[PDB]
């Protein structure tokens, strides 16, 4: 009899609890990276002195060691650094094994196989599959959120509140993120396998899934229909024929399900809060702690000058010249991660917007943008920091556009009408946190102007 596997006990319920994934409705093994899990492997015999067990884990359709999307690791007695399998105890035929993943491992669906070398033969069997997510309880993961209350809100809370309407008429709507409902984690994983990024280079897309900047920005693309047949099709016409009035959705679950079940065909119809709430499901499901931000008098600047320009022909007439507009409210998301590309001082909250307003490298996508960065006017940085600066802290200019000499001189500058009552749900309650002061310096002060100026000189 050659050394084989009789059966394996994944200790699913136990590992899910320790990995903080026990709430998803699923019989799968769901795990977080950088964190060991323990399995019991029942062999047909004892390990002999010369026989070798190799674990193999792969994710995605073109997996490879060099892209970090396949790993091969021996059952060992040692502390190793990558993927590793430690033999904790042998008890007759039964091996107690502690497996860990690196904290830099791509998130996704993985396959796990075991390759046995014994009697100058080789056997290879599939043990199973698991999902691996981002790990915000792990101090070295980029998505680390050390505060426990904040973590329960921004990861584990499946129900929320979005602020809506206009400065004079604030309202709030119930929103069921529903990340733990049946099939939803699975669907949110599907999303990543349907991006442009993936259609054009799957192997490299899947390798980039270790990075929340990358996952996060793909999601900002894929939650809208534009470009890629993503989840939701926006409609601001007023006419909601052939679908659901945006005001009639209560959460993300029906949306994401309807998307999957139609064969990844867009769902009709959404507006910004519907994009923000759906994106929030996706971000929380995958391990990126996130929340919903609403901005009243939100600028749509359409030419990267940090200002909303409604133009006036000299001698004082309005003109049709202008794409620049202002929404009563706009809603987007913030995701929590360090920014290794930017500097330690730019970590924390990063803006992500799935509403199709402006293109970015030719695609309806937006973010991530260091909130800290936007506030300090550091707008040369990746990604889309000019657009989002305008959103919360544009000036509003009036101009004089002479029809004849081409000269353009300013009538009046309004430096405070944009970006008001910026709001997100409280930790633990349904109270409104104001986070205006997190996005910009106080309106009508010095630093606020000298940072507007700093920012205006960083567009070049």
């Amino acid at each position: 009899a050659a050394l084989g596997v009789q059966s394996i006990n994944w200790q699913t319920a136990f590992n899910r609890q320790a990995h903080h994934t026990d709430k998803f409705s699923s019989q799968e093994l769901i795990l977080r990276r950088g964190q060991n899990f323990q399995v019991l492997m029942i062999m047909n015999k004892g390990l002999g002195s010369n026989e070798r067990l190799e674990f193999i884990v792969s994710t995605g359709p073109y997996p490879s060691e060099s892209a970090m999307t396949k790993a091969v690791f021996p059952l060992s007695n040692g502390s190793s650094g990558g993927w590793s399998a430690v033999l904790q105890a042998s008890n007759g035929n039964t091996l107690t094994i502690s497996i860990s993943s690196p904290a830099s491992a791509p998130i996704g669906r993985y396959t796990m196989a075991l390759q046995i070398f014994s009697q100058g033969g080789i056997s290879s069997v599939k043990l199973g599959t698991f999902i691996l997510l981002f790990n915000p309880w792990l101090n070295v993961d980029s998505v680390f959120m050390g505060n426990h209350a904040e973590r329960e809100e921004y990861v584990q809370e499946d129900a929320g509140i979005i602020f809506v309407g206009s400065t004079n008429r604030i309202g709030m709507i119930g929103w069921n993120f529903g990340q733990f409902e049946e099939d939803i984690l699975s669907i949110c994983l599907s999303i990543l396998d349907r991006s442009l990024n993936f259609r054009r280079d799957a192997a490299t897309d899947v390798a980039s899934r270790n990075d929340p900047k990358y996952v996060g920005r793909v999601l900002s693309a894929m939650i809208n229909s534009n470009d890629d047949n993503g989840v939701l099709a926006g409609n601001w016409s007023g006419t909601y024929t052939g679908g659901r009035d945006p005001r009639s959705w209560n959460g993300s679950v029906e949306i994401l399900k309807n998307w999957k079940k139609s064969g990844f065909s867009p769902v009709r119809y959404g507006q910004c809060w519907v994009f923000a709430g759906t994106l929030n499901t996706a971000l929380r499901s995958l391990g990126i702690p996130s929340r919903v931000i609403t901005n009243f008098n939100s600028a749509h600047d359409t030419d990267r000058n940090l200002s909303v320009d409604v133009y006036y022909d000299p001698m004082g007439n309005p003109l049709d010249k202008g794409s620049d507009s202002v929404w009563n409210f706009h809603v987007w998301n913030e995701g929590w991660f360090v920014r290794s590309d930017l500097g330690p001082s730019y970590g924390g909250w990063q803006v992500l917007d799935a509403t199709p307003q402006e293109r970015s490298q030719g695609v309806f996508q937006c973010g991530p943008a260091s909130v800290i960065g936007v506030r300090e006017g550091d707008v040369q940085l990746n990604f889309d920091m000019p657009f989002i600066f305008a959103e919360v802290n544009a000036d509003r200019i009036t101009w004089l556009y002479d029809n004849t000499t081409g000269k353009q001189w300013k009538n009046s500058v309004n430096s405070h009408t944009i970006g008001r009552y910026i709001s997100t749900k409280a930790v633990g309650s349904n109270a409104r946190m104001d986070v205006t002061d997190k996005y910009k310096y106080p309106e009508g002060s010095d630093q606020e102007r000298q940072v507007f100026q700093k920012a205006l000189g960083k567009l070049k």
Partner: antibody
Amino acid sequence: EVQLVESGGGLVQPGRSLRLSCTASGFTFDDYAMHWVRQAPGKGLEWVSRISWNSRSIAYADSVKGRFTISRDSAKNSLYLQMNSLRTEDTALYYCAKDHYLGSDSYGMDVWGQGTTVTVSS
Amino acid sequence: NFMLTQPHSVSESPGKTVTISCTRSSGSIDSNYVQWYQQRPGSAPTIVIHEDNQRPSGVPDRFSGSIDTSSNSASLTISGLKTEDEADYYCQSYDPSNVVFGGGTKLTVLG
């Protein structure tokens, strides 16, 4: 209540044409895909054709493709099936059905008409 | 392209529970929503389950739908059978173009 009323059925000869109509009431017609499904005496349901809410997406069973054309008319709240080059095997009860799904491209039949009978014989 | 296969017939006594399976020939059963319809002899079909497991307004909770990934099948379960439940039952799904019906199951309530 939703009502769907099919008409235009009858005895018709191989090779000829027949036009079925379905008038819809008690819901917003243009919000939904519509279908034709048929059923030969004592047999099962066979889906025939689907048209999307805005008529931009149409599909047909292979057994009828190139012979049957589906269409709809918003102002008349009506669905139609133009059946050309009929065959003895097209004999069936033809049902009109409203799709269940609003705003997504999934398909199910939430309401069905009583149907209109088509017999194909020379 | 796929087929949906149902059993030709099922039967049980009044008050008992019966299950009708619907197996998808290729592709995953949970890729696309499953509907179930009842058709009484000489009558138009009516829907009894939609979106795999949801019940239309006014369908008794004796009717339930399920999906079983491991057998690539959907199931319609009817508890507390009444003599009026005697009928043909059809499952239905689709791919992103074509609608597919199962071949139907005659449910007899044994008398």
